[PDB]
Amino acid sequence: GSLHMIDYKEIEVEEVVGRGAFGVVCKAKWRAKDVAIKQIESESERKAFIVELRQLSRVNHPNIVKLYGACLNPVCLVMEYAEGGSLYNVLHGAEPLPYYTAAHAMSWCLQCSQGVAYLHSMQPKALIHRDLKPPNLLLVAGGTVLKICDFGGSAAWMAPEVFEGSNYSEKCDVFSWGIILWEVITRRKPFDEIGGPAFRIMWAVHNGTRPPLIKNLPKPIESLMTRCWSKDPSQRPSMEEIVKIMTHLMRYFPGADEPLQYPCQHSLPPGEDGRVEPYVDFAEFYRLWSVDHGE
Numbered sequence: 001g002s003l004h005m006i007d008y009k010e011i012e013v014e015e016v017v018g019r020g021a022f023g024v025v026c027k028a029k030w031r032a033k034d035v036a037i038k039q040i041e042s043e044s045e046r047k048a049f050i051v052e053l054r055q056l057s058r059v060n061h062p063n064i065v066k067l068y069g070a071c072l073n074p075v076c077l078v079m080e081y082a083e084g085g086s087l088y089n090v091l092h093g094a095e096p097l098p099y100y101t102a103a104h105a106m107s108w109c110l111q112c113s114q115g116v117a118y119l120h121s122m123q124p125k126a127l128i129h130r131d132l133k134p135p136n137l138l139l140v141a142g143g144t145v146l147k148i149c150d151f152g153g154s155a156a157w158m159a160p161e162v163f164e165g166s167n168y169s170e171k172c173d174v175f176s177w178g179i180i181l182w183e184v185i186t187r188r189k190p191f192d193e194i195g196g197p198a199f200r201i202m203w204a205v206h207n208g209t210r211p212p213l214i215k216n217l218p219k220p221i222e223s224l225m226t227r228c229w230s231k232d233p234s235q236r237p238s239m240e241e242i243v244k245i246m247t248h249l250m251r252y253f254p255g256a257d258e259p260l261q262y263p264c265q266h267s268l269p270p271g272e273d274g275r276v277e278p279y280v281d282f283a284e285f286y287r288l289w290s291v292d293h294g295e
């Protein structure tokens, strides 16, 4: 239907907690709850907030941040406080990082595709994310439930047709999603080795460069991953196809519901040979798979 009204004086604003694509997001409280709000940096970016609100009023899905309300006091949005921060932090952030498992890796990606597919299926016209990357993916329920935010995006995750200002579509989000699958399995910043300014990744990716292949990555996941990387957007699978495939694969990745609670001391062997090592472990997957099939 449509969104709630929340005057700014009812909100109890606390510290900043991750600047978005254009605005700025902060921790806050509202009516005996924990809440996160975003406000305009300058008045010049008022236009986007009006476009954002009409979209977010329509969206309602478990893998998308639940908007509570808004106002035009200092004009702001009011969301659910994701206790676990962004996925980017979990993967690459502060000194003590959480241990996670292959089950978590796939669960997150599955949940992300469920959200993106909800947006792709939207009527009367589809919503393309464009800016799809871990800093925009948030985690709740002890790191178990993943949620998307910020619609309407560094080069590392951008599909190559977006660089060249060409007639892109929903398939660019699929490319991004492919990169994230590599990122969570390996726990590596994609194209970190290239470095330099953004245009050097864009050149590299535009010429064919993709992240390295992962050692002992099951073929089913490898082919899905590499198909999402297709230079040709039409050769990439729909997000609805990815949701189906991932769902099926989750049978061989039990224990996704276990909260993150174990510390992790990680060297992460930098020596990029031909391939790289996964951070997660696929032994349990091969085991369970072998039980269903032959090998």
Ligand SMILES: Nc1ncc(-c2cnn(C3CCNCC3)c2)c2cc(-c3cccc4ccsc34)oc12
Residues within 6 Å of the ligand: 017, 018, 019, 020, 021, 025, 036, 037, 038, 065, 079, 080, 081, 082, 083, 084, 085, 086, 135, 136, 138, 149, 150
């Ligand atoms: N709704 C949110 N709740 C909590 C956090 C959050 C992020 N970090 N932390 C804490 C977690 C506990 N430890 C300290 C950091 C909480 C965040 C971050 C964002 C966000 C980031 C980038 C773009 C956009 C666009 C709309 S919302 C949003 O939204 C958040």
